[PDB]
Amino acid sequence: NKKFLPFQQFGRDIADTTDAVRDPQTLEILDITPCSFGGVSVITPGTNTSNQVAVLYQGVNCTEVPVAIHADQLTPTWRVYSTGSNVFQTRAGCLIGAEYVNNSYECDIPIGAGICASYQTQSQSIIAYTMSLGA
Amino acid sequence: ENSVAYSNNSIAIPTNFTISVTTEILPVSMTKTSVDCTMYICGDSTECSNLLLQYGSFCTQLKRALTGIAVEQDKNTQEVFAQVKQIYKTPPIKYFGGFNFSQILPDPSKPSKRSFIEDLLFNKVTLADAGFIKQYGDCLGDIAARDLICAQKFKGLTVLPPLLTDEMIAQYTSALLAGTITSGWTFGAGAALQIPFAMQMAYRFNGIGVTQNVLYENQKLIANQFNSAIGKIQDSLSSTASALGKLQDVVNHNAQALNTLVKQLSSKFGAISSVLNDIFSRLDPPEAEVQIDRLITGRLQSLQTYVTQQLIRAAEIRASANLAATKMSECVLGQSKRVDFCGKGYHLMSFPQSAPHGVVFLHVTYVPAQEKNFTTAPAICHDGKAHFPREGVFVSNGTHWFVTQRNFYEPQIITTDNTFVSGNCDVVIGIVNNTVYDPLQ
Amino acid sequence: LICAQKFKGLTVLPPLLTDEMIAQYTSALLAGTITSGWTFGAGAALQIPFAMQMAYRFNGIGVTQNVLYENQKLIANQFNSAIGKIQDSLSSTASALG
Amino acid sequence: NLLLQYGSFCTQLKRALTGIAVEQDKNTQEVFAQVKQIYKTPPIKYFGG
Amino acid sequence: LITGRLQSLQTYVTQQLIRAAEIRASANLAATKMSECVLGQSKRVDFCG
Ligand SMILES: *[C@@H]1O[C@H](CO)[C@@H](O[C@@H]2O[C@H](CO)[C@@H](O)[C@H](O)[C@H]2NC(C)=O)[C@H](O)[C@H]1NC(C)=O
Ligand SMILES: *[C@@H]1O[C@H](CO)[C@@H](O[C@@H]2O[C@H](CO)[C@@H](O)[C@H](O)[C@H]2NC(C)=O)[C@H](O)[C@H]1NC(C)=O
Ligand SMILES: *[C@@H]1O[C@H](CO)[C@@H](O[C@@H]2O[C@H](CO)[C@@H](O)[C@H](O)[C@H]2NC(C)=O)[C@H](O)[C@H]1NC(C)=O
Ligand SMILES: *[C@@H]1O[C@H](CO)[C@@H](O[C@@H]2O[C@H](CO)[C@@H](O)[C@H](O)[C@H]2NC(C)=O)[C@H](O)[C@H]1NC(C)=O
Ligand SMILES: *[C@@H]1O[C@H](CO)[C@@H](O[C@@H]2O[C@H](CO)[C@@H](O)[C@H](O)[C@H]2NC(C)=O)[C@H](O)[C@H]1NC(C)=O
Ligand SMILES: *[C@@H]1O[C@H](CO)[C@@H](O)[C@H](O)[C@H]1NC(C)=O
Ligand SMILES: *[C@@H]1O[C@H](CO)[C@@H](O)[C@H](O)[C@H]1NC(C)=O
Ligand SMILES: *[C@@H]1O[C@H](CO)[C@@H](O)[C@H](O)[C@H]1NC(C)=O
Ligand SMILES: *[C@@H]1O[C@H](CO)[C@@H](O)[C@H](O)[C@H]1NC(C)=O
Ligand SMILES: *[C@@H]1O[C@H](CO)[C@@H](O)[C@H](O)[C@H]1NC(C)=O
């Protein structure tokens, strides 16, 4: 919705980044935002205990990570993690590979925003739940 | 300039006392951060990475140190705010010997559990952002490139949210307040034991050398003074440009460091320019690679300097965190006899409060108000034997001699049970003549 | 040497507090702790005889008051000898500042 | 003229070398300024021997 | 020459900033000792003398 003066070519901002450009053909204001990028973290309960893991992404809503996985062209297990088996979105990001419950107890592996991942035994799988301060 | 009328047979004793309330500000933790070496140092180009791969694995130790700092801040916060193993709940009633406590107790009416003073403190302090799920997508529209955090995310610098939320910190503070108001100080040494507030007040006055009869004969006055003081401090803390500069300093320093780091990216470093594509074009590889190497070395050195400068502040932040934990443990969970530590003057108690990236204390002190001239003597000789006060000072207004306690004028009559004799009265210096009641006879 | 380092842009700024004001603060603190006991730390200073303050301090560390009032001259002599000894030691020693 | 191309490192260093200066006098004032008034000894000096 | 001299200046300012923190810690300890052993007797053993 931002407007430009008639002589303005392309905008900028604080810390000298190219914010917006005006198309030469039509003279319409367009905006620029880069592709999604961020770190990747892997949660594991110990190789001796088990081998299945749950992955995580930081500061990314992951309704578009299957595209990134396909572009990466990795082994099929990476494409499996791109499927919507159990996708849970948090404040830090979204979690893939572990389901979500709401019975809360002592934390084992910190994640962020008061969420911890543990390895419950009931079949065995990685579980995610909310922090519990006590009784 | 003031002078003291010092005389070897003179003394002054207060009549009033006075309650007061003072605040204290202590940072507890800073903002965690992370960096993306590859995209920052060169950019979106591909050959930059190819030329970089023959360098050292510099990003490994940088990531290791940054992760260490990030986990260290969490450890500091958990250590300072998790000194109890139970979550106590206040009783439904709010009557404690006439005192006022609505200003600090949690309010169930507000959807967010945060008391009034905490509300004022949180609103006063302005942060870079409130939430953290905000991202490039949340910048869509005119918001793009309009926020400092948004531009930092543009430049490959991300911020990891703290593990503990604000609500958990508020609950911890509320539990500490409930434990220190209902169960006294005993809940820091095992299981909490309930006890009425007045008896705890009597204990605390007995701690600083005042008999409980002072409190139990003046309770309304102390209640009114405490209530007026807490109202006054509530009104005064709002003010403007208050002591919150200590908390503001950390945010200001972090913002300045990040701004300098991001703005330093656009330096030519003595090269032809500061654009990867421009250097890639208009020049053949043999000297373009030299220019790229120079630019990469300069940028990497600047990043290393930033990492070292950021690591510097962690030590002082940890020292402040340990000091805050010490103050919590030895001011809230008990009564400290070390002077000028848990406040100014004689100390009574404290109530902690939570602030963004820090902690707030509310000390409660005790100060004498109004003194009087009196004449004193070190000892008494009635039957050729020296007499000494069991505890207190021998005083007299001019006509008769009385014995009284230290920090509160309260004359009595000298009796055999209030004094103990020792030796003869021919070796002391300033003894006088008087008699002793000896109630047995 | 100072002039040599000056010509390269290296400078030293004077401290805000002159030594005279530091001496004045130290004298004020010593007076407050010598004539008013420890009361002046909390609120208004109150005059009190020095001997009674000594009795206070001995009553602090598990000793009854009658110990001091029967041995005042010995205490004075020992304190004076100690202050003379520390003055002499400080005069003789020129390396303990470290 | 050439130094301007290297950036604003001079501003960074000048800012850095002022925190120390304020730190020193803050430390001194905090350590010593602990009395609200300025007392002085009485004209006579006899503290019980 | 410019980059070498600037790097040397960076090292020197880093060292000064290192020493400043230790000076602060010593000053804070001195202030605490002042408060706890000049304004009143301290029951802590061997803390003062
Ligand atoms: C470019 O020249 C064309 C010549 O007609 C101008 O008209 C545009 O023509 C293109 C293709 O036929 C259309 O897609 C545009 O919608 C036309 N413009 C408008 C405003 O209707 C066009 O204006 C010129 N562009 C400039 C001067 O920026
Ligand atoms: C001790 O202090 C209290 C308050 O500082 C004095 O009480 C005041 O008494 C006057 C006259 O009765 C009232 O008008 C005031 O309202 C009282 N104060 C308050 C806060 O209500 C009291 O007089 C002092 N003690 C002595 C012995 O005078
Ligand atoms: C305890 O403090 C609260 C807070 O001031 C008092 O509630 C106030 O009551 C007055 C009159 O009833 C109202 O005008 C204010 O608006 C109230 N303040 C708030 C924040 O709600 C309460 O009366 C005090 N309790 C006692 C026993 O005095
Ligand atoms: C010092 O205090 C004593 C104790 O109150 C005073 O003695 C009393 O004075 C009142 C005043 O008329 C008499 O009614 C009492 O009978 C006195 N007590 C006795 C035991 O006789 C004394 O007056 C005070 N002195 C000064 C100078 O104020
Ligand atoms: C305290 O009282 C005693 C006893 O009344 C006084 O001792 C007498 O003082 C007179 C004064 O000259 C002497 O003549 C007597 O010989 C003393 N008696 C004894 C047994 O020694 C004493 O002087 C009084 N103290 C003061 C300071 O007046
Ligand atoms: C895994 O558990 C086994 C069984 O005790 C133990 O010997 C091994 O050390 C564990 N793995 C690690 C990495 O400690
Ligand atoms: C991803 O989720 C966040 C919060 O749930 C939301 O603000 C954002 O719009 C979502 N992304 C897209 C592309 O809708
Ligand atoms: C867990 O699932 C939902 C999550 O919001 C919750 O409402 C529900 O009450 C929980 N399950 C049980 C059995 O309580
Ligand atoms: C007490 O002070 C007065 C005057 O200051 C002095 O004359 C007297 O000698 C002193 N007392 C003693 C025991 O010396
Ligand atoms: C105590 O006596 C001194 C000596 O004259 C005097 O200056 C002071 O004002 C007196 N105290 C009070 C509370 O009046």
Swiss-Prot record, chain B:
Feature type site, description Cleavage: 114-115
Residues with glycosylation annotation: 8, 16, 100, 373, 397, 433
Extract the ranges annotated as region (Fusion peptide 2).
134-154
Q: Which residues form a coiled coil?
A: 248-292
Fusion peptide 1: region residues? 115-136
Q: Where is this region: Disordered?
A: 127-152
The chain's disulfide connectivity reads 37-59, 42-48, 139-150, 331-342, 381-425
Sequence segments annotated as region (Heptad repeat 1): 219-269
Effect seen on changing residue 326 to I: In strain: Gamma/P.1
Q: What does this protein do?
A: Precursor of the fusion protein processed in the biosynthesis of the S protein and the formation of virus particle. Mediates fusion of the virion and cellular membranes by functioning as a class I viral fusion protein. Contains two viral fusion peptides that are unmasked after cleavage. The S2/S2' cleavage occurs during virus entry at the cell membrane by host TMPRSS2 or during endocytosis by host CSTL.
Report the protein name in the record.
Spike protein S2
Native organism: Severe acute respiratory syndrome coronavirus 2
Top-level taxonomy: Viruses, Riboviria, Orthornavirae, Pisuviricota, Pisoniviricetes
- Gene name, Swiss-Prot/TrEMBL: S
Portion held of the full protein: 702 to 1142 of 1273
